Amino acid sequence: EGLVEYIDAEEEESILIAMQPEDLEPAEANEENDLDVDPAKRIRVSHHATTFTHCEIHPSMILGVAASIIPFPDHNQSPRNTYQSAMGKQAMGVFLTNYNVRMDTMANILYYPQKPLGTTRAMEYLKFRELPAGQNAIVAIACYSGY
Amino acid sequence: TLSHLRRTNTPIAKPRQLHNTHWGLVCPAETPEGQACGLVKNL
């Protein structure tokens, strides 16, 4: 019906992609320095060129399979999100529902897996909630002794 | 299991840096630590 177009890198040179469908072509107010807004929210570039052609699906989609596991990756120092990417692949849980029937050299399973209390909208398509690899543990940040 | 089936290799200017054109095709953060870092990519 012509609503989506498979764009490669070379053809990516001739187009002007928007970022946020809604906030990227609504009208003027404007807001910037104009009263009033939410002080605690972030500062966005703003749309300043308007002769768009395409528009992105949802930015979270720039990510990979291991990376979309991370909660709020846009609040972390970059090299950190790369570490979690390597470790997520070395965590432990349900690796297939048929583990009791296969015969493969070495395999680990978690007595009591849990779906995390904080999740990505992208975990949904990766079926992480049905095959988790961690436990929601109660955690304290203190000194307490020195061990 | 998922993350291995989407893996990109590269044999041997500066082909390790994350290049602008990677936007939305290869994932920025996903990549192996040390040894062969950045020659390997996840989609």
Binding site: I57, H58, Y125 | -
Partner: peptide
């Protein structure tokens, strides 16, 4: 009202229907 454009949440419904097809290894399969 079928006219008003896509917004915040609506952006996801598309995604899921993308995966409802190609799944997760389409490149490998195709």
């Amino acid at each position: 009202d079928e006219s008003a454009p896509i917004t915040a949440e609506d952006s996801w419904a598309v995604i899921s229907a993308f995966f409802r097809e190609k799944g997760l290894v389409s490149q490998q399969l195709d």
